[PDB]
Amino acid sequence: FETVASFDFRDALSKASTPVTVVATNGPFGLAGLTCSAVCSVCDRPPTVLLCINRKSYAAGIIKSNGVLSVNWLAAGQAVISQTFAGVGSVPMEERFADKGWQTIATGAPYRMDAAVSFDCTIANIVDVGSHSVIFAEVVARNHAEECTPLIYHRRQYATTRSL
Amino acid sequence: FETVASFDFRDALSKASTPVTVVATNGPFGLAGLTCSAVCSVCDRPPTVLLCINRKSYAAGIIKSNGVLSVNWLAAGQAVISQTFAGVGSVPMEERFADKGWQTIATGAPYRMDAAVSFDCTIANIVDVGSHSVIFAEVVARNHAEECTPLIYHRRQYATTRSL
Ligand SMILES: Cc1cc2nc3c(=O)[nH]c(=O)nc-3n(C[C@H](O)[C@H](O)[C@H](O)COP(=O)(O)OP(=O)(O)OC[C@H]3O[C@@H](n4cnc5c(N)ncnc54)[C@H](O)[C@@H]3O)c2cc1C
Ligand SMILES: Cc1cc2nc3c(=O)[nH]c(=O)nc-3n(C[C@H](O)[C@H](O)[C@H](O)COP(=O)(O)OP(=O)(O)OC[C@H]3O[C@H](n4cnc5c(N)ncnc54)[C@H](O)[C@@H]3O)c2cc1C
């Protein structure tokens, strides 16, 4: 079988929906983060999620060397946070965490305390696939905001949820 | 750093949101599918998605032995499909695919033609982590309905999308 064209693959994907997260890190290699939607739960013992991140990025370099990271599922009101960590407005990497919303929990990685879900994590394993590092991370702390319907991405726009 | 309790992990995840897919298969080891939300795109060259499925699933062994599968992102109108494939009504596998909305495209796996997005795939890699097989699959064909509006899962209920 022949795989679909890359362009057709991305077009089709725009028609699926995802949550939106920010993955962030800090430690001896410094502070960094990027917006990431390719994230999912893997198993509960040990509690493990994975995230797939293009290895060419500033943030990927730092995340992999710090060896710790946070995954921060954004609430409906946080599209600007997502835009910032996707590089909309070209906000310099270390200027991205200037606000009380980020604090430390267990690892030293910055946690978004008003995110719908925040997992503080250590990296356990990495599987490289084409351009992306698939990073398997074990959850060593969790946090939740009070009142957060999700930020959703779909058809290249942000959205949130409503009952069926 | 000690990991969080499994129970905390699961609770936290209920507060995140995910699309809802049905992962289906067919071939020499038979028909099977199940509903899966632990799915994401990995890279576009080659076009690869991954999905995490509990090895306890009846459908897991059949999917991995057939070597082929589809991922079907369900639309807002399709909660009954999600329910059928999560085992509600305990519908027998073959009978799950009796409806003519399920066709073959390229691999032989059943593809839901009216699903918001359907990727027909061949398995490329399987990495077993805790209770789950993380299955990497390369996209060989696709199909999309005209209706992309997502079925979403969140706080243990179905939802769909709204503008912000
Ligand atoms: C919103 C949502 C998201 C989900 N996400 C995931 C996910 O990301 N990963 C995951 O692993 N699960 C996921 N699930 C769970 C999943 O879909 C199922 O609910 C789970 O696998 C249990 O399904 P089952 O009741 O069909 O049990 P199973 O044991 O998996 O199978 C039972 C029924 O289906 C298949 N049969 C069973 N035994 C035999 C036999 N001895 N001989 C011949 N035929 C047999 C069975 O045949 C039977 O019809 C999700 C469910 C929901 C609702
Ligand atoms: C809602 C959203 C989700 C994103 N998810 C991821 C992800 O899971 N993994 C990742 O490495 N980067 C993701 N990004 C990209 C990322 O956050 C930065 O924008 C990127 O590192 C910036 O580099 P660039 O200027 O070359 O932009 P780009 O040329 O746009 O980025 C190029 C490469 O890194 C960025 N991938 C996966 N989903 C998306 C997406 N919806 N939009 C754009 N790129 C995507 C890509 O993945 C791609 O391989 C996402 C961006 C947004 C807005």
Side-chain angles (χ1 to χ4, degrees), chain A residues 6 8 44-45 139 142 160, chain B residues 4 6 8 11 44 142 162:
Chain A
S6 294
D8 201 26
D44 73 357
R45 222 137 251 218
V139 179
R142 72 187 278 211
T160 187
Chain B
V4 297
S6 297
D8 283 315
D11 178 28
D44 64 22
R142 38 87 99 139
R162 177 228 322 241

Side-chain angles (χ1 to χ4, degrees), chain B residues 1-47:
Chain B
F1 312 87
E2 301 277 49
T3 52
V4 297
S6 297
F7 175 97
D8 283 315
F9 180 74
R10 298 193 303 268
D11 178 28
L13 288 181
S14 75
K15 290 174 145 277
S17 65
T18 59
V20 177
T21 80
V22 171
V23 169
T25 184
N26 194 204
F29 297 79
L31 249 1
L34 82 166
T35 135
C36 170
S37 48
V39 170
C40 64
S41 47
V42 172
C43 53
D44 64 22
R45 176 201 297 295

